[PDB]
Design an enzyme around this catalytic site. Structure first.
Site, PDB file in Angstrom:
ATOM      1  CB  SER A 181      -0.902  -0.019   1.191  1.00 24.95           C
ATOM      2  OG  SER A 181      -1.735   1.093   1.247  1.00 24.95           O
ATOM      3  N   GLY A 182       0.728   2.133  -0.975  1.00 25.14           N
ATOM      4  CA  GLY A 182       1.532   3.347  -1.049  1.00 25.14           C
ATOM      5  C   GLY A 182       2.798   3.273  -1.905  1.00 25.14           C
ATOM      6  CB  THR A 186      -3.155   3.448  -8.512  1.00 25.24           C
ATOM      7  OG1 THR A 186      -3.836   2.355  -7.881  1.00 25.24           O
ATOM      8  CG2 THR A 186      -4.157   4.288  -9.291  1.00 25.24           C
ATOM      9  CG  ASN A 229      -2.157   5.548  -1.131  1.00 19.94           C
ATOM     10  OD1 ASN A 229      -2.083   6.760  -1.331  1.00 19.94           O
ATOM     11  ND2 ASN A 229      -2.254   4.664  -2.117  1.00 19.94           N
ATOM     12  CB  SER A 232      -5.795   3.524  -0.047  1.00 18.66           C
ATOM     13  OG  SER A 232      -5.741   2.111   0.007  1.00 18.66           O
ATOM     14  CB  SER A 233      -6.799   1.163  -5.246  1.00 14.40           C
ATOM     15  OG  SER A 233      -6.337   2.155  -6.143  1.00 14.40           O
ATOM     16  N   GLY A 453      -2.910  -3.561  -2.141  1.00 12.51           N
ATOM     17  CA  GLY A 453      -1.676  -4.194  -1.797  1.00 12.51           C
ATOM     18  C   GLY A 453      -1.607  -4.660  -0.395  1.00 12.51           C
ATOM     19  CD  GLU A 455      -4.944  -2.603   3.462  1.00 13.26           C
ATOM     20  OE1 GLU A 455      -4.674  -1.478   3.096  1.00 13.26           O
ATOM     21  OE2 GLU A 455      -6.077  -2.987   3.613  1.00 13.26           O
TER      22      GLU A 455
HETATM   23 MG    MG Z   1      -3.780   1.881  -5.904  1.00 14.10          MG
END
Ligand code: MG
Length: 728
Positions: A181-182, A186, A229, A232-233, A453, A455
């Protein structure tokens, strides 16, 4: 080739190593040799440079920063590469391949905003956390058609390689972007779409703009700010860019995965809800706010709980203009958009419904301002919704019985309605978009995978297990294609290769989660989800008895009774079992579905009457669970990628503070370890990367020795049965 070889160009200024000075040459010529050592022996990831001053047959003796002299056996020495290697674009070329050396090169590069570096066949991307101008249209044109060796590392470069391999080999390709994550997934995903949309687009190319504007839509409803993030997605997506035989873009298709719809009703402290909730309340006209009974985000229980309504450097009012513009390009009608915002405004109203204890233990609603406001925008009968929330009818055998749910269960059912509404709107959005881009029967495609991701949080739940289990499978796919399939080929073709074990196998952790026989965590969770007297504690009690002291990847903690630990490639994660049964079942009172099937709004009704949106597949007498359903569509995806040629991009987060110009030693090295980066370099150097069949391997017709002559005209490279391999 003017700007590639022009030091004045933005290309060399922003994508190449700067010219060393007169003083640096004198050090690049030195005969001295240096070594990477640990000043603090047990601070394993922090190194310093030291000069080798003497050596024995088996040992180096080097100097410390302080002046002391330390000794290390040559078999345990991390030699420093000559500084002429500092900044090298492909770290396959390094003489010494060790952790401090690999990190050093990346550091040298990171310090000049050189975020992209090759590691053999795959790319490494270190998040800069700052905007660097290497994604302009001018940069796209430079990389167009260029070989990997001819230009510098870049996301466009490997995107072009996939495009050329698609046309040369006539096969589908995939660009798999890993990272926690981060780390940068993306952002690099967007660039892959940009590049492909340009080099393969048609110069009235509105399809190409439409593809570009599809992702801004999904980010507003799909992304949110977490502690790791700000964008974050909260959902995974497989983006399938499609081409025709000629090679031009013919269409596109998005396959979404695993929306964290529990976030619509709850967020951890400092975290936010999905962007769209704040974009509406901030960018809606006075007309709209009055029509939807709206207020500031401080007035809504779904937005005034974490203590944070802003993201540093983000204008929700301005971002709202972008998604509305993106919805125009894709072709959502004005009433579609207005119905969408009704659903969002209605969800927030539903969140302020407060149930309180009545005369009996059952719940009651003494204030119905939120109820009516929600019913108004949705277009449903409020008192019907009211009874469907607090008094749902179920079957007891065949009798029709009306419940009277307490405050707790009334609020939970209200949340179920909210999550159902939002989750179905999201599938609708993806579905309307896929239909606008479903305009041609593909010839080939290049698939781009952008998942949530790895996390870890103070509290990890069923959502985090599904996310981390997905990241565990992607890492295994990297292991599979880089080391097992690679050597299996060598072994099969009999080129006298001695198998190597690179020690990268996530199979034990994957079996623990998704295994059927013996049953894994998801199998036991499904088993308890249907057992009528099962609890959250009977579930974890079941998990402990099955895996505690039995599976080496599973730990029953001594410090807690509701948590269990799973050892992932990226680290151990402790998961809280609370609410797992209801999260796997994903229940919704059907009385609530009936009430929204009678809704005035055209969109809302399709969310509850369209079978593809609103139905759920049945497994015998029970609905298919979230675990079983996601497992099926994950398996289908990995089947798609095994059939395509993979191109890997390993995104690396420099630190856990989302700051630029701060590359932290031990945060980077752990990702390099668990990603298998150095293992991925060694296999490319020791091994032989490509092999062409003998017939196609200068009389151009014939015997495997026919091709032998050509190399003679031009140990190092070897022959196998039916193919010929090359090295370096
Ligand atoms: Mg993303």
């Amino acid at each position: 080739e003017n700007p590639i070889h022009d030091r004045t160009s933005d290309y060399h200024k922003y994508l190449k190593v700067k010219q060393g000075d007169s003083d640096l040459f004198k050090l690049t010529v030195s005969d001295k040799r240096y070594i990477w050592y640990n000043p603090d022996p047990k601070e394993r990831d922090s190194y310093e440079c030291g000069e080798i001053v003497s050596e024995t047959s088996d040992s180096f003796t080097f100097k410390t920063v302080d002046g002391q002299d330390r000794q290390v056996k040559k078999d345990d020495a991390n030699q420093r590469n000559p500084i002429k290697f500092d900044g090298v674009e492909d770290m396959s070329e390094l003489s010494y391949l060790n952790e401090p050396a690999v990190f050093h090169n990346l550091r040298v590069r990171y310090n000049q905003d050189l975020i992209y570096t090759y590691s053999g066949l795959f790319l490494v991307a270190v998040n800069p956390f700052k905007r660097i101008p290497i994604y302009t249209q001018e940069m796209v044109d430079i990389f167009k058609g260029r070989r990997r060796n001819e230009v510098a590392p870049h996301i466009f470069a490997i995107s072009d390689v996939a495009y050329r391999s698609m046309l040369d080999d006539r096969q589908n390709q995939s660009l798999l972007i890993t990272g926690e994550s981060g780390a940068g997934k993306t952002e690099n995903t967007k660039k892959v779409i940009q590049y492909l949309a340009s080099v393969a687009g048609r110069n009235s190319g509105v399809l190409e703009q439409q593809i570009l504007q599809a992702n801004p839509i999904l980010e507003a409803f799909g992304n949110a700010k977490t502690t790791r993030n700000n964008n974050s997605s909260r959902f995974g997506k497989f983006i399938e860019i499609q081409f025709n035989s000629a090679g031009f873009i013919s269409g596109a298709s998005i396959q979404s995965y695993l929306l964290e719809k529990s976030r619509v009703v709850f967020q951890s402290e400092t975290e936010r809800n999905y962007h769209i909730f704040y974009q509406l309340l901030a960018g809606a006209t006075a007309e709209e706010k009055k029509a939807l009974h709206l207020a500031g985000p401080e007035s809504f229980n779904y937005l005034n709980q974490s203590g944070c309504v802003d993201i540093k450097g983000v204008s929700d009012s301005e971002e709202f203009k972008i998604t509305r513009q993106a919805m125009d390009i894709v072709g959502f009608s004005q009433e579609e958009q207005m119905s969408i915002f009704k659903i969002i405004a209605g969800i927030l109203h539903l969140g302020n419904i407060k149930f309180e204890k009545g005369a009996g233990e059952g719940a009651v609603l003494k204030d119905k301002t939120a109820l009516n406001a929600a019913s108004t925008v949705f277009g449903v009968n409020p008192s019907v919704l009211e009874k469907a929330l607090m008094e749902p009818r179920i079957l007891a055998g065949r009798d029709l019985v009306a419940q009277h749910l307490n405050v707790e269960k009334s609020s939970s059912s209200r949340d179920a309605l909210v999550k159902a509404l939002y989750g179905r709107l999201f599938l609708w959005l993806v579905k309307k978009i896929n239909n606008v881009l479903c305009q041609e029967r593909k010839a080939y495609f290049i698939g781009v995978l952008d998942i949530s991701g790895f996390e870890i949080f103070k509290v990890n739940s069923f959502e985090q297990l599904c996310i981390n289990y997905t990241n565990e499978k992607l890492q295994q796919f990297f292991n599979h294609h880089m080391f097992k399939l690679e050597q299996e080929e060598y072994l099969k073709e009999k080129i006298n290769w001695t198998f190597i074990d690179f020690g990268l196998d996530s199979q034990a952790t994957i079996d623990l989660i998704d295994g059927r026989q013996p049953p894994g965590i998801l199998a036991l969770l499904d088993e308890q989800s249907v057992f009528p007297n099962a609890t959250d504690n009977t579930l974890i009690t079941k998990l402990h008895s099955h895996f505690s002291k039995k599976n080496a990847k599973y730990e029953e903690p001594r410090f807690s009774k509701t948590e269990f630990g799973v050892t992932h490639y990226a680290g151990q994660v402790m998961y809280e079992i609370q609410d797992w049964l209801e999260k796997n079942k994903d229940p919704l009172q059907q009385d609530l579905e009936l009430c929204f099937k009678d809704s005035s709004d055209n969109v809302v009704t399709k969310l509850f009457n369209d079978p593809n949106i609103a139905s759920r597949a049945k497994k015998g007498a029970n609905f298919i669970t979230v675990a079983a359903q996601y497992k099926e569509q994950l398996a289908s995806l990995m089947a798609t990628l095994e059939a395509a040629n993979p191109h890997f991009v390993r995104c690396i987060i420099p630190n856990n503070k989302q700051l630029p110009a701060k590359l932290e030693d031990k945060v980077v090295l752990d990702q390099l370890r668990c990603n298998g980066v150095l293992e991925g370099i060694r296999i490319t150097r020791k091994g032989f990367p490509n092999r062409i069949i003998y017939a196609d391997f200068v009389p151009r017709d014939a015997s495997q020795k026919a091709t032998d002559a050509v190399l003679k005209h031009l140990e190092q490279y070897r022959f196998g049965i039916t193919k010929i391999f090359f090295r370096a």
